[PDB]
Amino acid sequence: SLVAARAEKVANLYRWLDTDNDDVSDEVKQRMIQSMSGYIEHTDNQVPKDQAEALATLFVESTLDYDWDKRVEFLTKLESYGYSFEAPHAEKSIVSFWSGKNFKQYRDILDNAQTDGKKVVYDIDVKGNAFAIDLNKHLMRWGGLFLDPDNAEQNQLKSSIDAATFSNTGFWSSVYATGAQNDVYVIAEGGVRLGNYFWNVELPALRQLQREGLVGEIRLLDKPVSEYKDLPADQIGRRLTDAGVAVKVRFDALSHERQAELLADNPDGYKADTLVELDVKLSAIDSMLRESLPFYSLRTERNLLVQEGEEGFEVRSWPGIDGKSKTILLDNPEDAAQQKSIERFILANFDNFEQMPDELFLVDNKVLSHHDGRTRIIAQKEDGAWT
């Protein structure tokens, strides 16, 4: 179970970043689920004839519910079938946030480009990863086939199968990339744009992952394939760490005084639809990341996992021995200064998880605690006077 450990780490980020902007029928679901059962049960693979309808219920449940526990479940349940999403050392080449025509072409370019004697590992070259994506795509196939765009909340189901399955792929690419840690080559096709999933959720994951040492030396391929062909390795990919992120906006959505400037040079080369590339500072991405993630230091230092709870928060052990739930509650759950105290406090104090209270609590510069009975252990005074 080498996938549960890392996969747990990455799903954590996606929970935080995705969740910032993210009824269903059961009759329709069980048809979905059942073709789900049918794909695997009656296709050639290590799908138990018993637990093959147990995967097309977990898979579809995990994806569309956006249960991140059922996502690691089905990652590691696939690891319980001889599957593997750890790459064979070498150098990884994740391209999976997008899909464009010229994806094969980048590989041909890349392998000859990396003249070592060794070729570049692919995320869809992996044993288990490659199963999962095929399962994803069947939902996708199921997606645009048994749902009609002009019969009400049936297009709403499709738009949600596309939005889950995209969450899935980007998740798997990150956990794959977390494996080996040998530097990645994300290949964005049209060019990283802004306002989409990849940008708000997926890109922060990679750099937030990378910072934590998990992955390293990410290079982004946005310029057309022609641009790369054969030159020194440095002209291959825009390194994340150099400068900022080379995104593409449209003239339309650009400034009013910056359209004028743009038409001073090359005065009728720009139209409404025309796409203009402008570097996003890499300083800005980092900063929204360390504010997109509560108890940001607890994650790094004390090998804990914090996540939003029904009313408070939920700290757990990083390698999940068990699905226990030492919580952390606050009088203002939304005050950052309160949070910072509780973090600073349980940081300067507890060294590990199992050394934690059932449930901690911060009320008006006072600290509660659980054990077996509420024990108030701090002081609103300049230095916290324990007990």
Numbering used by the authors: 1968 to 1989, 2007 to 2371
Paper lines:
Multifunctional autoprocessing repeats-in-toxin (MARTX) toxins, secreted by multiple Gram-negative bacteria, are primary virulence factors that promote initial colonization, dissemination, and lethality in a wide range of hosts, including humans. By doing this, the clinical strain V. vulnificus MO6-24/O generates a MARTX toxin (MARTXVv) containing four effectors, which are arranged in the following order: domain of unknown function in the first position (DUF1), the Rho inactivation domain (RID), the α/β hydrolase domain (ABH), and a Makes caterpillars floppy-like effector (MCF) with a cysteine protease domain (CPD). The data show that DUF1 acts as a RID-dependent transforming NADase domain (RDTND) that disrupts NAD+ homeostasis by hijacking calmodulin.
Later, we did manage to generate crystals of DUF1-RIDCBD (residues, 1959–2374) in the absence of CaM, and determined the structure at a resolution of 3.38 Å. DUF1 within the DUF1-RIDCBD structure comprises the N-terminal domain (DUF1ND, residues 1959–2227), formed by a bundle of eight α helices (α1–α8), three 310 helices (310h1–310h3), and four short β strands (β1–β4), as well as a small lid domain (DUF1Lid, residues 2228–2264) formed by an α helix (α9), a 310 helix (310h4), and two short β strands (β5 and β6).
